[PDB]
Amino acid sequence: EVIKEFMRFKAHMEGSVNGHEFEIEGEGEGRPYEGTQTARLKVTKGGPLPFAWDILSPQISKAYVKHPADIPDYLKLSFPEGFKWERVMNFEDGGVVTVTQDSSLQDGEFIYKVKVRGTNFPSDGPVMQKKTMGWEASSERMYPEDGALKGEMKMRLRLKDGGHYDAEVKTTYMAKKPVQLPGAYKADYKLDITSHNEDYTIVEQYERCEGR
């Protein structure tokens, strides 16, 4: 049908973190029913970034989440029109990241438009000093509320110096048509940076996500 067993995507991201503006463009591919995907991203403006790429990686794809048959796959069902999402991440040291995203399907490939704002990150923190080392696996609590599918999760970022750096995350995912919302369930994620040049202006990532 509209969602094939293999799908490519194009992504464009604009934003600002602690006042630093940037643009990122990327292309990816994956297997939406198996919950797996990879992408190649390039910082096209504002590179090299003065902050950890790790805060941007989750803002680059929910059409690729493996679901059981008895769970309506609301975000897949939303296509060809698609869906929008709005996210707020509250980090333990007061940093905040907010995101608004549009997902659409244009002639057989997914199109992602992302806007990112980060603010209040301590200048001496792991984000502005780039001391981060990738996200631990996460479980997102999914639940229907107010005509939308909501997600909530605590995410933990590994630090290069030893510890962990935590965020509280809340996201609203909204189909462009009112397709069948699921009941409550959990989506488990693993997101890895698989390749990156010295300054991270070219980065590759891989993610597996499965609803339980």
Numbering used by the authors: 6 to 65, 69 to 220
From the paper:
To create a further red-shifted monomeric RFP, we investigated whether the AYC motif could red shift the emission wavelength of the far-red emitting RFP mPlum. mPlum is a member of the mFruit family of monomeric RFPs derived from DsRed and differs from mCherry by 13 mutations (excluding N- and C-terminal tags). Its fluorescence emission wavelength (λem) of 649 nm is the longest of the mFruits and is red-shifted 38 nm compared to that of mCherry (λem = 611 nm). Ile65 and Glu16 appear to be major contributors to mPlum’s long emission wavelength as replacement of either residue results in an up to 40 nm hypsochromic shift.
The two mutants that displayed the highest red fluorescence intensity, mPlumAYC-E16A and mPlumAYC-E16P, were further characterized. However, unlike mPlum, the highest intensity peaks for both of these mutants in the pH 7.0–9.5 range are the ∼390 nm and ∼510 nm peaks, suggesting that the majority of RFP molecules contain a green chromophore instead of a red chromophore. mPlumAYC-E16A and mPlumAYC-E16P also mature to molecules containing red chromophores that emit at 639 nm and 637 nm, respectively. Interestingly, these mutants emit at wavelengths 10–12 nm shorter than mPlum (λem = 649 nm). This is presumably because they have lost the dynamic Stokes shift resulting from the H-bonding interaction between the chromophore acylimine and Glu16. Since our mPlumAYC-E16A and mPlumAYC-E16P mutants emit at 637–639 nm, we propose that their 11–24 nm longer emission wavelengths result from the red-shifting effect of the π-stacking interaction incorporated through the AYC motif. In the mPlumAYC-E16A structure, the centroid-to-centroid distances were 4.1 Å and 4.0 Å and the interplanar angles were 11.6° and 11.1° for chains A and B, respectively. However, these structures did show well-resolved tetrahedral sp3-hybridized C-alpha atoms at position 66, indicating green chromophores.
